[PDB]
UniProtKB/Swiss-Prot annotation:
Indeglitazar binds at residues 69, 103, 253. Belongs to the nuclear hormone receptor family. NR1 subfamily. This is Peroxisome proliferator-activated receptor alpha. The chain holds residues 200 to 468 of 468 of the full protein. Heterodimer; with RXRA. This heterodimerization is required for DNA binding and transactivation activity. Interacts with NCOA3 coactivator. Interacts with CITED2; the interaction stimulates its transcriptional activity. Also interacts with PPARBP in vitro. Interacts with AKAP13, LPIN1, PRDM16 and coactivator NCOA6. Interacts with ASXL1 and ASXL2. Interacts with PER2. Interacts with SIRT1; the interaction seems to be modulated by NAD(+) levels. Interacts with CRY1 and CRY2. Keywords: Activator, Biological rhythms, DNA-binding, Lipid-binding, Metal-binding, Nucleus, Receptor, Transcription, Transcription regulation, Ubl conjugation, Zinc, Zinc-finger.
Amino acid sequence: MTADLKSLAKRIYEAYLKNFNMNKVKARVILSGPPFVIHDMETLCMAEKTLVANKEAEVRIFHCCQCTSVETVTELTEFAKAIPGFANLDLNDQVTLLKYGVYEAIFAMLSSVMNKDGMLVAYGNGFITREFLKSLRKPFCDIMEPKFDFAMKFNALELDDSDISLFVAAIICCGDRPGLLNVGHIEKMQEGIVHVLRLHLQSNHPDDIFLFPKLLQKMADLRQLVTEHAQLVQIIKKTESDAALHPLLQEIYRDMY
Ligand SMILES: CCO[C@@H](Cc1ccc(OCCn2c(C)ccc2-c2ccc(SC)cc2)cc1)C(=O)O
């Protein structure tokens, strides 16, 4: 890798460590063994009563997840400035790339805090079990299990934060998002990031030279995961009278898929 490329990879990496609340190194430290375990209705309510000393438990959970989304949206917007060319793009194209990319990035990064038994929540202070989420009443029990299925395979790739930062940058740089005005410049931006991702993976993972095509397929998987998630969110929005959607997230979903 040329010093410029090698340096650009570090640039991306440092912006990822700087802007994102959680990262894989820290998550693994906490998960290695002290997070309060949410494994049933009793422990969920105990955990809630920590913050609010009426709505169904499923709906409370539905709204906590949204707060994590809003926060990650803000962090991703700042992260994106480190991508060579992004800040030089038309303002509307920036909005378009982030609108379509944020949820793909969200589910990619949530894998870092997930293992086969559950996931870290509430800024590392809670661990909610996979089985508890499966026990929620339909259709809320169908929200997270596809995310766990994705994460277990994604985590099997054994990426580190230096790979993931580039992967997330690559996600944001997809030149085939609908409504992009300056498609040609975005494709050049994408080609540059994917170029850095490709070379970095070869350097960082000599034991798996097929990691790059595996990750391209995970990008396609994430796109389908997001489409299906948005559909389930919409169904919960229309049915379920107590389920509200944060206005920033509504605008993300609006006219998306
Ligand atoms: C259903 C909405 O899905 C979102 C996308 C989305 C899906 C799962 C998610 O897992 C966040 C972690 N988690 C789960 C899995 C249950 C409860 C929490 C939790 C507990 C306490 C806190 S304290 C702030 C924060 C979160 C995060 C974002 C969207 O569409 O925006």
